[model samples]
Target: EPYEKEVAEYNKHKNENSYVNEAISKNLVFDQSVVTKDTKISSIKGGKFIKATDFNKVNAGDSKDIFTKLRKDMGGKATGNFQNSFVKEANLGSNGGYAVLLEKNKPVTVTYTGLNASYLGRKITKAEFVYELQSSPSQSGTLNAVFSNDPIITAFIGTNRVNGKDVKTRLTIKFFDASGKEVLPDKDSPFAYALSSLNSSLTNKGGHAEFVSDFGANNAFKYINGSYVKKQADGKFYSPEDIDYGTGPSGLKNSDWDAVGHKNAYFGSGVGLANGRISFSFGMTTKGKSNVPVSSAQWFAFSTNLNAQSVKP
Candidate 1:
């Protein structure tokens, strides 16, 4: 018989004082063994298993059984199967085990500074941006930003794995001007850019060695002869020096800066504008031993923005 029908019959006669009630209670076994081994079980087709210990913990009175307790726990509703009932019970009862909902294709956004005259006293040049996960080249995508255009690029974040003590995944960012020309920072110009991640630590494992910046330093960087160098004592990358704790042009706050050598903190990369591209790597631990799931907040927090100005030599 269907589990739902069995439960219905049990509920109907649960209050009757008869020998049939006693037989029903004794035969209505909802244990894991019966769930897995019995082919007649059709109600809990996709439900999680309730362990024997957990099943025994439900208070079964002299007139009732553990199944009655389960029905009561489910708000006295026995019409549906026990799918996800164990998961719900585990969460509400503070049990150690829970289900992991796979969210491998969670949507994420990359926020960068759009053209703003307030920063440099002139309209910043529009640029075309290309982004992709370093480990997966076929997933490369692009975004175009112009004066007063929206500064957010939408994308999907993926999972990252560790291989031989190194993270195998990284996000790469590249830039080009409106004419399809690469936007390389002038070797002698003072270029400032900021990068942020809501969670995880940034690294520089691939791409041009010249674009590497100190992840331990602040997120603000300057372009020198051939490399991007960290410039600020704190993670503040905005002007009006006293305004250090609020959101910046890229939608990241000062507190989001990754701490030096801290892998799990809200961290970011120092901006690097070398070779017309910058690649960012992330680590969850010092040795990069574990994999980062797609559900991690770091994937949602990845963003960037730039502020370049010409300085007298």
Candidate 2:
């Protein structure tokens, strides 16, 4: 509370919602000219070396905040993903979240081979699905569990440019075996049949398995890239026309922008940026399936959207 009076005085003059610049000290270093120069700092073999100055050496009497408290609650591995040098392989050494479009509500038989960890002999029996924009799970009418090979769930999934609102979609799936017994994942276990079971790379030791599961689900969101822009290559922002330019799908093309007005829809359509997402469903057997080892039960999960429109249709 030492700065309580000083803080109150500062807040009195503050605009509450605007960028404020003030001189911290008479000799306060400034970088406006360097940051705003016409020549990008990225235009160099090695850009300007900027030394870090904010973090003074940690010593005695450092103040700890709510973060330290939450870290302990999260098994002290809250930041381990960045700190640890570990590897997590998906089931059968393949990336999770595979997406395939449904054709006329027909039965699709997807085969699995060379799936990592020998997760073979897996197939969805007579599976059928329909997409619906169920706002969220906390509420009713969620598009869940209506699984069938010839599903009649005529749920209308809205879209951005083509259909209705742009929100998360609920993919209703009811998976079964050769027989008609319904199978689901045993909602128990730390790994939950994920790569995290091999090690704590995805988990904070025994903590935060749900957090890692959320990681897989988070990938459902769309990945957007800028159009016909200066992207840093080698060490410089190269315009695609430049001879030194490298290759990657930056966007549709620079030409997509040249013909556009303020509404650059053409700039977004068909380019990699306009493409929405991919989805994969993973099925596995775990002890928690039935709380017994002899009887192997089945369960599966798909990463879905929470905050943003991860899938297109």
Q: Pick the candidate with the highest lDDT.
A: 1
- Model 2 agreement with the true structure over 93-166: per-residue lDDT tens digits: 12111111222222333321111110022232323232322221111211111111112211111111111111
Tens digits of lDDT, candidate 1, 1-313: 3664454344321222222311001111111221111112112122223333333243434323322322212111213213332332321222212111111132112223323211112222333323322222111221110110122322222222223122112334334333444454343432343333323222332111111223322222332111112222222121211112333223434354334333322223333332224444432222222332221112222233322222111
Candidate 1 residue 293 Cα shift, in angstroms, is 7.4
TM-score of 2: 0.20
Clashing residue pairs found in predicted model 1: 258-267
User: What lDDT is obtained when candidate 1 is compared to the true structure?
Assistant: 0.25
**Model 1 spans with C-alpha error above 4 angstroms:** 1-128, 132-156, 160-174, 178-180, 198-288, 291-297, 300-313
In candidate 2, what residue range of length 10 has the lowest lDDT sum? 194-203
Best by TM-score: 1
TM-scores, all candidates, are 0.29, 0.20
Taken over the whole model, the C-alpha lDDT of each candidate is: 0.25, 0.20
Q: What is the C-alpha RMSD of each candidate to the true structure, in Å?
A: 28.8, 28.8
